[PDB]
Amino acid sequence: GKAQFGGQRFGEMEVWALEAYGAAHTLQEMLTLKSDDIEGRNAAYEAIIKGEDVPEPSVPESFRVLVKELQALALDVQTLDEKDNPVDIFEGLASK
């Protein structure tokens, strides 16, 4: 919304159009650096303010929310590397 100084919604069909163009990097920017990659958007703003190029994106926070909500339904959702070993996308903040 304009009253909330909000941003435009990049919905499903816009993502379809970007995919049809083959613009992988623009779409990844829209998904992470501009919406909900917190450290990513912070680093991007700092890099632009300092004159460098924007850094590589990370996992968006909405995926972490999805994982946490799937755990609430007693479902073990786990991300694995190339050798099927667990990869911690929470940086260790949720491990006892």
């Binding site: 379809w16 159009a17 613009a23 990097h25 920017e29 919406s35 755990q71 073990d76 070993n85």
Partner: protein, 1370 residues
């Protein structure tokens, strides 16, 4: 940090939940009511979930960093970042186990399938309506022994557990006919009006009086309700002993002497089915103990129990009564279900199901396979079935269920907090009530509500009334509601997001812009490029540092002049993305170079409006700013407007002249025709010249001189060059539309100065005179089709840069000439022909005849209605023809006629409605009115005619409103079925192909006629030749891409009978995994060149199919005198048609057998003869004694695709589906290549069903992917076993999408609960192959620049390259 490559989902054990949690939440308290701090052991406790403040405990002992990982002793809060409050889980320990509703209510039930329990049986057991028995212990029910897994109701269980007994009351004043302690047979009356109904011993309840003897004479003692009798019936008493104990010591009844004691006048009788045992000393078993036959009962073992039962020691009569019962172990609810699930042995059950799979029964085998699927999923995943029952319930982190203070000071909460509170309350009350030893009824009630609370927390509104907050009827939003739906997490936050660096505004036409430019408001650019602007102003002397620049830019009156120049510096060379909703195709987003403008409106180029489907009556557009070098390069190279001139769907130009541009070019390129001369004869030119000069012949009249057709203008005005002719035009000597003679290109052309001017425009635009002369058609007026063909040919011959330059030139000159042409619309421009009046009067004649033919009897009602309708439609057609004939003959420059002919605006129907008449109208039921609207819009309608047409207008509006949603749904289904298909390799190496026909059979005359050229172009253009073709002395080699000229050559050759079909590669025969190859796909239709490796052709195909359906299919419908989208949706879903026709399953000859009541068709082969009984009213496409092939239709209507698959095979179904889908789009005038439908159909035919598993572990009837079974068969051949035997299947787009391997895409598509539960049981691992999964993960999609084929490319200059070798040369 290792990259993520796979995501696994599986069931969670109670140990896993306890390992996740940082502590158990013990109380339903959320926060303190007065200090607004979280309550201890609550749903927001910092001890469990983490601190609210950064690096500071709750009690304030530690308020600094460096304390990470240590827990404060006073408060119990670890000192760390507060963000951990959105990651850390909790748990609740349930007093009794509860079932996860996803595994109970998702049909077919997984638990019910595992335990072989029906849905009603599980409903009964889980929710405490019936018992389920374990270890029956040899109990007898109704004479039949009880076996495990048997359902007992409450009364049936109670009778077996406790024994049968009843109580019969006795009215006051009426005694019984029996004694105390005697056995009673069923039916033995105990009173004059009381009759027993069960067998067993009967005992008195509350005798009213007691008779005490004295050693004789008797005595009576009254027994009041408040005092009780102690002495046994018929037992002696001693002096001083008590008989009737009372509340008051002085009121007790004390025996005076020795005598027997008897009890009489009972209040009721209790008849039980039990054994009785007197005793005379201490007993061994007390009340409430269960015994077996032959156990010690009393008298130190003198008496022994003879039956199973429960003992009660009646001390009043000093007798042990053993009620016949059992120690049966029957349980109800999730505890019993979990006990059953634990005991299940999967290997033995699998062996039993494998043995069952040998039954000749098809249904029994199918059900055995259904059970075996779940069993094998559990076996392979390693999950334990008992994990399906919850013992510990996970608790979501508090930050995802916040309790926040709004700006008004009030608190806002999530429904999850209330659901958790309800669950915790019921659990705590259950624990308290269990600690008190409460009766079974209350425990059953409490456990019922606990199960319901767990259900509401996991899935609210599934069984029964959903839980709502008091004072409202809004259902509470459960976890499943959060996860799924259009409003759920997947579709609302993962597949689409709101973004930064974006804006939106109204759009206005930008006629002075170039094709690659867009007008962007100054303030919009200031807000969009703010960080780059801050860097630029800090670099200059505008501000000392970034903070000062921000402070300057935050106040409007604090902005200066040099910052605008800095902004112009910032955006130099950069592009922005413009998007208009709905984004139907990929050209709904385009990249433009921003030109800073004043005002608040975005300025849009006229030539991109058609691609955007945008007009200027209030439309708005969104603006986005790509940030990095990669994003800017992608936008400038791939998504720039000037680089996208051809449609990805058809290959035809999409950025092309329209509206005013067409009008102006047509106006200047049309030639004037006059009738003053009208074919006069002259022997020499000079006499004709003098005749014109004296005023008898018009300049453009078609005269004949010396045997040659010519005009006075051709002879009088001969110009040496175009410059001279245009100079004469500038002096008013001739008009742009007059036909003169001009010398151009070394030739003498009789043409008009306007056409010469158009040729010069094109030649100067493309900077090439010979090519421009080749491209244009000089001798015709320039209209929409000719201009589009010119744009396409210029593209092919010159490239995108010169084509865009030519487009800009055409736009400029079209606007300029449309301004000064004098195009206007007045009321007199809607010319009404005279013949219309005649055409009406003649009709008024015929109508009378029809009425007469009905008033005398030679006509029925239906025929009269039909003849009236046919008369009126023919009259309307005649009026249309007259209107356009009048326009062509008398007013060739009429504005409406010019607009309709040039293609700028309007079609003949609208022109007729304006000029001739509106015609017939339809009633709301769908039938036509009898009287038509005989007035046009110029004449003005009457009130009745207006109201009659209102029905059709409203119906068209409703059509649009309620069909656009169905078309959007179809587009989404196509995207979710084809999103994974990408161009992944140069050549798959296959030798299979398809044969595109050039001649279509006809139902009438059964003859082959050449197909429409548009259809052949849609089916052949851009494809790769599978085999060599020799036509007209021309060799088309193998591996050749068919250009448009090649397609035209093939059509020309086919018209001579030299070729009948074309063999081409196709996606239907491609062998690439998860996609296609370059050769099997062909051209990139938007670039007229072979497709690049890495193109996401599945998304392109889905958009190409979906976009025309959204607007142009059965746009504004005009109410004027199995079809459309429903037929297309039926074909894409493999729906069985309701008007289904009948096909022949086998070869043979036709013999129709028709009797006066019934009709049948026999197909007689040489081996067999089959029959088809058909309704007499059905239509027949064949005749008696004709030959039909297998799968050939015998009736009119839609063909069932699955029956055709069984009859003819897979390729026939592919061809049928492609052709039948193309029919609907062709009827609408939509050009769309066959490749997109071929891709979707290839996805539709992805699966096979096993008929014979052979030596594999597969099961009969198991559906699986074709690739996997082919690979399995190849490996079996390598090992030396028998192959698996399979048959192809055909599935709709929805079921094909939901049957995919990736659980992320299927979960984000539809039916989230079912997909998630099946994947969790199976332990599925997602390999992230498609686009949707990578979008959900926020990764780089494997398409375009993210393709592995191109994304590892390196770039280096010559200087660096050599010295790197000089290092290696060492």
């Amino acid at each position: 940090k290792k990259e993520v490559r796979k995501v696994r989902i599986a069931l969670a054990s109670p140990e896993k939940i306890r390992s996740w949690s940082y502590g158990e939440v013990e109380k339903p308290e959320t926060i303190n009511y007065r200090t607004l701090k979280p309550e201890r052991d609550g749903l927001f406790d910092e001890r469990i979930f983490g601190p609210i403040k950064d690096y500071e405990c709750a009690c304030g002992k530690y308020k600094r960093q460096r304390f990470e990982g240590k827990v404060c002793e006073r408060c119990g809060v670890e000192v760390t970042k507060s963000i951990v409050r959105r990651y850390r889980m909790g748990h609740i320990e349930l007093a009794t186990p509860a079932a996860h509703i996803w595994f109970v209510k998702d049909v077919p039930s997984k638990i019910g399938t595992l335990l072989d329990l029906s849905a009603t049986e599980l409903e009964q057991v889980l929710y405490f309506s019936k018992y389920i028995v374990l270890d029956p212990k040899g109990a007898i029910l109704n004479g039949v022994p009880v076996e495990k897994r048997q359902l007992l109701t409450d009364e049936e269980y109670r009778e077996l557990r406790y024994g049968k007994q009843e109580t019969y009351p006795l009215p006051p004043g009426v005694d019984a006919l029996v004694k105390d302690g005697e056995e009673v047979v069923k039916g033995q009356e105990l009173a004059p009006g009381v009759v027993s109904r069960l067998d067993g011993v009967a005992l008195y309840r509350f005798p009213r009086r007691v008779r005490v003897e004295y050693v004789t004479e008797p005595k009576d003692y009254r027994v009041q309700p408040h005092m009780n009798v102690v002495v046994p019936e018929g037992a002696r008493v001693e002096a001083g002993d008590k008989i009737v104990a009372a509340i008051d010591p002085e009121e007790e009844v004390i025996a005076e002497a020795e005598g027997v004691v008897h009890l009489h006048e009972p209040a009721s009788i209790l008849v039980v089915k039990a054994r009785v045992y007197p005793f005379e000393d201490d007993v061994e078993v007390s009340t409430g103990d269960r015994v077996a036959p032959g156990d010690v009962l009393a008298d130190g073992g003198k008496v022994k129990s003879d039956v199973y039962g429960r003992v009660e020691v009646d001390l009043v009569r000093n007798v042990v009564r053993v009620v016949e019962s059992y120690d049966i172990d029957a349980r109800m609810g999730a505890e019993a279900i979990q006990q059953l699930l634990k005991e299940l042995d999967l290997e033995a059950l699998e062996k039993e199901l494998l043995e069952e799979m040998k039954h000749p029964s098809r249904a029994r085998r199918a059900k055995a396979r259904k059970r075996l699927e779940v069993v094998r999923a559990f076996l392979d995943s390693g999950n334990r079935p008992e994990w399906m029952i919850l013992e510990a319930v996970p608790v979501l982190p508090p930050d995802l269920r916040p309790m926040v203070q709004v700006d008004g000071g009030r608190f806002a909460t999530s429904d999850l907090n209330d659901l958790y509170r309800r669950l915790i309350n019921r659990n705590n009350r259950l624990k308290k009530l269990l600690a008190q030893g409460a009766p079974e009824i209350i425990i059953r009630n409490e456990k019922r509500m606990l199960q319901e609370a767990v259900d509401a927390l996991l899935d609210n509104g599934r069984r029964g009334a959903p839980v709502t907050n008091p004072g409202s009827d809004r259902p509470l939003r459960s976890l499943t509601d959060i996860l799924s739906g259009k409003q759920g997490r997947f579709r609302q936050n993962l597949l689409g997001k709101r973004v930064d660096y974006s804006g939106r505004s109204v759009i206005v036409v930008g006629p002075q812009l170039k094709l690659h430019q867009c007008g962007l408001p100054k303030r919009m650019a200031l807000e969009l490029f703010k960080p780059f602007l801050l860097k630029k102003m800090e670099e200059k002397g505008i501000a000392p540092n970034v903070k000062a620049a921000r402070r300057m830019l935050e106040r409007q009156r604090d902005i200066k002049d040099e910052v605008w120049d800095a902004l112009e510096e910032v955006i130099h060379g950069k592009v922005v993305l413009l998007n208009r909703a709905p984004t139907l195709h990929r050209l709904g987003i385009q990249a433009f170079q921003p030109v800073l403008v004043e005002g608040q409106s975005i300025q849009l180029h006229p030539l991109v409006c058609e691609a955007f489907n945008a007009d200027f009556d209030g439309d708005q557009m969104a603006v986005h700013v790509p940030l990095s070098s990669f994003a800017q390069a992608e936008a400038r190279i791939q998504m720039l407007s000037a680089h996208n001139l051809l449609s990805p769907a058809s290959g035809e130009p999409l950025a092309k002249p329209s509206r005013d541009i067409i009008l102006g070019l047509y106006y200047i390129t049309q030639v004037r025709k006059e009738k003053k001369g009208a074919g006069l004869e002259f022997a020499t030119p000079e006499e004709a010249l003098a005749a014109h000069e004296r005023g008898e012949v018009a300049l453009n009249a078609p005269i004949k001189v010396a045997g040659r057709e010519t005009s006075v203008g051709r002879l009088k005005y001969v110009f040496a060059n175009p410059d001279e002719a245009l100079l004469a035009v500038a002096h008013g000597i001739v008009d742009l539309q007059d036909v003169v003679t001009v010398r151009y290109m070394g030739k003498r052309l009789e043409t008009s100065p306007g056409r010469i001017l158009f040729a010069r425009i094109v030649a100067e635009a493309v900077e090439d005179e010979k090519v421009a002369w080749e491209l244009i058609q000089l001798d015709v007026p320039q209209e929409k089709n000719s201009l589009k063909d010119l744009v396409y040919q210029a593209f092919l011959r010159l490239g995108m840069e010169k084509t865009a330059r030519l487009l800009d030139a055409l736009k400029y000159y079209g606007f300029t000439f449309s301004t000064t042409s004098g195009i206007t619309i007045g009321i007199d421009d809607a010319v009404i022909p005279e013949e219309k009046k005649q055409y009406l009067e003649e009709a008024d004649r015929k109508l009378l005849q029809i009425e007469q033919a009905y008033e005398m009897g030679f006509l029925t009602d239906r025929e009269r209605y039909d003849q009236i309708l046919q008369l009126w439609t023919e009259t309307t057609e005649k009026v249309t023809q007259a209107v356009f004939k009048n326009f062509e003959e008398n007013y060739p420059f009429n504005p409406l006629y010019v607009m309709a002919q040039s293609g700028a605006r309007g079609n003949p129907q609208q022109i007729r409605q304006l000029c001739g008449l509106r015609g017939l109208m339809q009633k709301p039921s769908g039938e036509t009115f009898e009287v038509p609207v005989r007035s046009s819009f110029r004449e003005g309608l009457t009130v009745l005619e207006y109201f009659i047409s209102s029905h059709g207008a409203r119906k068209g509006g409703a059509d649009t409103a309620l069909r656009t949603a169905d078309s959007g749904y179809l587009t989404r289904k196509l995207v979710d079925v084809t999103h994974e298909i990408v161009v992944r390799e140069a050549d798959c190496g296959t030798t299979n192909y398809i044969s595109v026909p050039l001649f279509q059979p006809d139902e009438v005359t059964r003859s082959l006629r050449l197909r429409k050229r548009a259809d052949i172009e849609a089916g052949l253009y851009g494809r790769v030749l599978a085999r060599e073709v020799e036509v007209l002395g021309v060799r088309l080699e193998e591996g050749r891409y068919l250009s448009m000229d090649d397609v035209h050559l093939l059509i020309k050759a086919a018209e001579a009978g030299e070729i009948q079909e074309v063999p081409v590669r196709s996606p239907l025969t491609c062998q690439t995994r998860y996609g296609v190859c370059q050769k099997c796909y062909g051209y990139d239709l938007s670039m007229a060149r072979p497709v690049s490796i890495g193109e996401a052709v599945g998304i392109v195909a889905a958009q190409s199919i979906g976009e025309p359906g959204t607007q142009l299919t059965m746009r504004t419908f005009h109410t004027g005198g199995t079809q459309g989208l429903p037929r297309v949706i039926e074909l894409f879903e493999a729906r069985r048609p309701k008007a289904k026709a009948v096909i022949s399953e086998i070869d043979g000859v036709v013999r129709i057998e028709e009797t006066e009541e019934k009709l049948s068709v026999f197909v007689e082969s040489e081996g067999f003869s089959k029959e088809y009984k058909l309704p007499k009213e059905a239509r027949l496409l064949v005749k008696d004694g004709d030959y039909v092939e297998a799968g050939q239709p015998l009736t009119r209507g839609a063909i069932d695709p699955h029956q055709l698959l069984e009859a003819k095979g897979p390729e026939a179904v592919e061809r049928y589906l492609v052709e039948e889908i193309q029919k609907v789009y062709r009827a609408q005038g939509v050009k769309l290549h066959d490749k997109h439908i071929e891709i979707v159909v290839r996805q539709m035919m992805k699966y096979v069903e096993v008929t014979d598993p052979g030596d594999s572990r597969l099961l009969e009837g198991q559906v699986l992917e074709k690739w996997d079974v082919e690979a399995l068969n190849e490996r079996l051949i390598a090992e030396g076993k028998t192959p698996v035997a399979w048959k192809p299947l055909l599935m709709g787009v929805t079921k094909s999408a939901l049957s995919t391997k990736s659980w992320l895409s299927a979960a984000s598509f539809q039916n989230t609960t079912h997909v998630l539960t099946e994947a969790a049981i199976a332990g599925k691992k997602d390999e992230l192959i498609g686009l949707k999964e990578n979008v959900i993960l926020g990764r780089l999609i494997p398409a375009g620049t993210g393709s592995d084929f191109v994304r590892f490319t390196q770039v280096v200059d010559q200087k660096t390259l050599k010295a790197i070798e000089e290092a290696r040369k060492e």
